[PDB]
């Protein structure tokens, strides 16, 4: 999971 | 403020290809000369300008069978259908002309681009 | 010996979400209490262990309407349906419990994982 | 396009  | 799962789109496409292999929820047969290819209309539209046009048509949207132009090569179509479902293109010296012509007909611009670049490098 | 187009899977998913927004080729309505959500069975199966089980069932595969457990929160379902079609999860303090419970019911393991990690960080 |  990432900060887009 | 959303978070994003990097592999989600790839995981979705892998499962759509599994559905195609098992012939689950396929709703169209694409006829290319003597050969038949089962697929999902939604995936075909998502990958191809030609299928996007065909399946948004108020009459063609309900057809269970679509016949492509007799000039279309079945192997070229097979390679492009595999690409649609996997992001992988089996581009070879022996098939590049058929792949590029099929990609132009199917309106798959990124495939056409690369076929053009690969041909230019060999001339 | 294939080549691969990096953005292909993301581009496919973006077009599947466009089809959902325009209600093109949607083949199921998911009923969550008083709310209704139209979707594509193939995308639901590709994202959820619950829908994969439901739509591989020889009777349920043909249903046009699926009713979820009355304990399922419509907003939680909405957030997860948006995630299925975009890879983006709108995870907030006010919705995390509903999102995690809905993801457990839908069998969306990566979403459950992250909800667990976000809750653990706040305790 | 890349070599996967
Ligand atoms: N709704 C919808 C929807 C479903 N599919 N789809 C598009 N599919 C498409 C149209 C043209 C081209 C390609 C894909 C690959 C290419 O080279 N050209 C576009 C849009 Cl703007 N919208 C949609
Ligand atoms: N054919 C087919 C096919 C269509 N969909 N699909 C799967 N869908 C799925 C099943 C379980 C789970 C998820 C997705 C996300 C998750 O957390 N669990 C799996 C397989 Cl093995 N195959 C398929
Ligand atoms: Cl393309
Ligand atoms: Cl997930």
Q: Is B49 in the pocket of ligand 1 (CB under 6 A)?
A: yes
Q: Rounded to an integer, what is the distance from CA C34 to the centroid of its chain?
A: 18
In C57-95, which ranges are continuous DSSP H helix?
Answer: 74-86
- Residue C102: strand, helix, or coil: helix
Ligand 2, atom 11, lies closest to the CA of C49
The angle at the Cα of C21, spanning B22 to B84, to the nearest 5 degrees, equals: 35
For residues B77 and B105, what is the distance between their CA atoms, to the nearest angstrom?
A: 10
Quick check: B23 and B39 in contact, CB under 8 A? no
Residue B82 · residue B99 · CB < 8 Å: no
Ligand 1 in contact with B46 (CB < 6 A)? Answer: yes
Give the pair of three-digit tokens for residue B67: 């016949």
Among residues C27, C100, C23, B102, which one has the least CA distance to residue B89? B102
Experimental approach was: X-ray
Give Cβ neighbours of residue C19 (< 8 Å, ≥ 6 apart): B42, B45, B46, C25, C26, C40
B61 CA → ligand 2 middle, Å? 27
| Interface probe, candidates A1, A2, A3, A4, chain C, greatest C C-beta count within 10 A | A1
Helix (H) or strand (E) holding B39: strand B35-39
Rounded CA-CA distance B37/B31 in Å is 7
Q: Which residue of D has its CA nearest to C8?
A: D1
Contact (CB, 8 A) for B76 and B95: yes
Nearest CA to ligand 2 atom 12: C49
Helix axes C74-86, C96-106, angle to 10 degrees: 70
Query: DSSP assignment of B45-113, as one string?
Result: HHH-HHHHHHHHSTTGGG-SEEEPPTTS-HHHHHHHHHHHHHSEE---TTTHHHHHHHHHHHT-HHHHH
| Whole-angstrom distance, CA of residue C66 vs CA of residue C31 | 6
Q: What was the resolution (in A) of this experimentally determined structure?
A: 1.9
Q: Which residue among B40, B52, B55, B104 has the greatest number of ligand 1 atoms within 8 angstroms of its CB, and so is best to mutate?
A: B52
Residue A1 Cα, gap to closest chain C Cα (Å)? 8
CATH code for residues B1-123: 3.30.710.10
Contact C41, C25 (CB under 8 A): no
């Amino acid at each position: 999971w990432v900060i887009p | 403020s959303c978070i994003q799962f990097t592999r989600h789109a790839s995981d979705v496409l892998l499962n759509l290809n599994r559905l195609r292999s098992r012939d689950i929820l396929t709703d169209v047969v694409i006829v290319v000369s003597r050969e038949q290819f089962r697929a999902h209309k939604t995936v075909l539209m998502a990958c191809s300008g030609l299928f996007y046009s065909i399946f948004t048509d108020q009459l063609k949207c309900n057809l269970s069978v679509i016949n492509l132009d007799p000039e279309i090569n079945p192997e070229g179509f097979c390679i492009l259908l595999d690409f649609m479902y996997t992001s992988r293109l089996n581009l070879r010296e022996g098939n590049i002309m058929a792949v590029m012509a099929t990609a132009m007909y199917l309106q798959m611009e990124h495939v056409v681009d690369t076929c053009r670049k690969f041909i230019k490098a060999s001339e």
